[PDB]
Structure 1
């Protein structure tokens, strides 16, 4: 007999121990240690009772990479990117990713080492673009003898929350252009009506999270050129291309949205969305070195490479740089094109099957990013006992997360549902989702009384 079996010795079974009769620590660090197997289970087991990543259809962020990328990134788990003197090959590799992304967006910059920065996501990449737009505007207004204490920026009401963070954390006024059924993306005319001498940039979005659509950057650029010629305000574009920045170059090469446009001075993207890398990657590029203020930035030479030093974070994992560069080499342009082709084709397939179901109507007939939204047919909704929130709950019973929500300004009465198709979500998985949607519809149509969310609508 083993005296200390329950206390945690070499013979203890994890689930025959005193520790696994005790709660996990909520407030205070435990006084003493446990065995690695026990602590492993205590943390691991708490992650079971939630959505499985591959069935999270709310997220845009990568939930699958192949086994070689995964092994490569796991092996770099202890590499701190910012130690560039210690890890100069990764610093160079980061710069090469920046070059490749800038050239994917048709940068006219002549320098071999393109002007850009690594980010943890589009959040940091967006904030860097906006701070740069803010600093360029401050300098221009100062040289003109004009005030520079009340900056603002203009964006669709379909903005993603990081722009609200930017507005709050830097105390910059956000001006929002509302969505309507007639103007389902940012209308250039209405955005310009909200511009003045204090506007630091307009932010069109490629891959609006609420709708899956693309603001027309080319139409914005054309309108802005006329407006800037008339006012002299010299207002630029920063493209929030979080999703579309890794869709448009491969599937829509002739759509002019990027550094080909006169007024697009910076672009940001989520490398961990359709850049196909696990969580923790974003990129921001500037059209040239003259658009990244010296106040924000400096550059260091590593093994002949000019790597710009700009960022909100400092120490950070380096694994995502290896993952991105691996994808660029493993897939190339052709491979990126076929993977995004698959994701868009599957999104289009689900869109078409949803349109055939009696309760549903799609927000758009045009699927340009691998995601889309739909709502209840207005005539169907009036007499239905259920809402899209009830459908979300039914789908959750089978492990899916398919989110229902209200649309932004002036469409807020529309409850919609969104499906995002990422690499690793196949046609076969689409059929499973659609089968569960049909069954969920059949069960909810048997209801004799309205649900809580249905009553709230009336």
Structure 2
């Protein structure tokens, strides 16, 4: 709570309205304080484009569409066109034409919502068409935490399966975990922890053999992998090119470079998509439907997804991806050169680094002391850096490597040193899950404290 001193806190409505100009000044001052961290490339992920002109462009898209609520297609036909076109272009980018032109889907609020919708959809589809009432889903331990959210929300038993030596899903273990109640298996393309792409072709084949769904979580890779493939990088098919793939999520607000608050969920056929829709026919409020979880939605954010995709085009995504993967190549070579560190698996641009000899959490804390905001991992202990366009700016990768070399030297010199956040991550890694839940619950409460 860094502003507790500098700015008044508001626990109650002001009696009189406060001047707009004063309100904007506070927000602008906070922006000046907060933006350097992501602008200058210190943040893993978080901001995916970050360019001044791109941002000013999407801000004006927002301004022009600010009143849009896609719950009312009759008032905002513009926004329904934008969502239809985002879905179509994304589907085409992800091998939709290979499905025979039946690929369809919706815009969502984010990768989490795309995953939740897909999970609910397989649940309802399986109940209706296979008589399954105690649904199960099989995913690798690396699959996003949102799969557990979906499981707990929709009453699906989540079975998480082990990874091989390369941190990719062990498909044999996935086959073993399938039962008559399994409704879907998933693979990540790539997974968030270690940036590796699961063996999608085998997972898709597994699913098809069992007549169950196969969801590919391409939230992180959907706007990168197709371009990496065209640039010559090693990437096997991960999308609708695979016969057994029945849905794919992809985040326009990650490497699509749209504004935060949008993603896409795609299904192989409409008969599947139809299980996602909510329709109420008996309500005194009249006919009511929604394609996704929300009722009212900020249509302006859909406009920003559409605008971003159109302003980039294939050549734009190709260039962005090129820059990111070149930076990644350079970063990975540097990490491999530093003694006592290793990279987990063989990632293209989301790089998890670990150490068998040193406390990786203190190496991470040493980086944080130099301004870096990296993601702390566990199982196993590691940190990761998800490279973005912010990291392709001049000097950024070199600063990272220089800082990391220094971090490692400092930790080797005092291997028992543990400061700042390092003991927090270490304790969290060792702690019983229930204890973690209690403490993190207290933490969320603290974020909401007004003093």
- TM-score, length of structure 2 as denominator length: 0.81
Q: What does 1:280-291 align with in structure 2 at a 5 Å threshold? A: 280-291=261-272
Distance in 2, Cα, partners of 1:338 & 1:448 = 42
Question: 1:17 corresponds to which residue?
Answer: none
Question: 1:319 corresponds to which residue?
Answer: 300
Larger radius of gyration: 1
Distance in 2, Cα, partners of 1:49 & 1:334 = 32
Q: Deviations over 1:9-50 (max 9, x none)?
A: xxxxxxxxxxx9996335433444433343334455556369
Distance in 2, Cα, partners of 1:350 & 1:120 = 32
Give, in angstroms, the shift of residue 90 of structure 1: 2.0
The answer to whether the 8 Å contact 1:61/1:279 transfers is no
| SS class of match (2:274) | coil
Q: What does 1:44-55 align with in structure 2 at a 5 Å threshold? A: 44-45=28-29, 48=33, 52-54=37-39, 55=41
Distance in 2, Cα, partners of 1:63 & 1:417 = 22
Question: 2:353 corresponds to which residue?
Answer: 374
Distance in 1, Cα, partners of 2:391 & 2:374 = 14
Distance in 1, Cα, partners of 2:340 & 2:129 = 54
Structure 2 gaps of 5+ residues are 280-288, 431-451
Distance in 1, Cα, partners of 2:297 & 2:264 = 14
Higher helix share: 2
Question: 2:62 corresponds to which residue?
Answer: 73
Q: Deviations over 1:70-128 (max 9, x none)?
A: 4323443333333211110221121011111111122245569x521011111111111
Distance in 1, Cα, partners of 2:363 & 2:162 = 27
Which among 389, 409, 413 is matched to residue 423 of structure 1?
389
Give, in angstroms, the shift of residue 335 of structure 1: 1.9
Which among 179, 182, 185 is matched to residue 199 of structure 1?
182
Q: Deviations over 1:111-153 (max 9, x none)?
A: 69x52101111111111111111111001223xxxxx321110
Distance in 1, Cα, partners of 2:215 & 2:377 = 27
Distance in 1, Cα, partners of 2:278 & 2:87 = 15
Residue 443 (1) aligns with residue 392 (2): no
> How many residues are matched?
402
Which among 346, 353, 357 is matched to residue 327 of structure 2?
346
| SS class of match (1:283) | strand
Distance in 2, Cα, partners of 1:447 & 1:373 = 23
- Flag the 1:295–1:421 CA change in 2: closer, same or farther, 3 A: closer
- Flag the 1:294–1:34 CA change in 2: closer, same or farther, 3 A: closer
Distance in 2, Cα, partners of 1:283 & 1:295 = 13
Q: Deviations over 1:39-64 (max 9, x none)?
A: 33445555636983334533355352
Which among 200, 203, 207 is matched to residue 217 of structure 1?
200
Alignment root-mean-square deviation, CA: 2.9
Larger deviation: 77-86 or 201-210?
77-86
Question: 1:117 corresponds to which residue?
Answer: 106
Question: 2:220 corresponds to which residue?
Answer: 243
Question: 1:395 corresponds to which residue?
Answer: 367
Give, in angstroms, the shift of residue 422 of structure 1: 0.9
- Flag the 1:40–1:416 CA change in 2: closer, same or farther, 3 A: same
Distance in 2, Cα, partners of 1:22 & 1:240 = 42
Which among 277, 280, 289 is matched to residue 296 of structure 1?
277
Residue 167 (1) aligns with residue 151 (2): yes
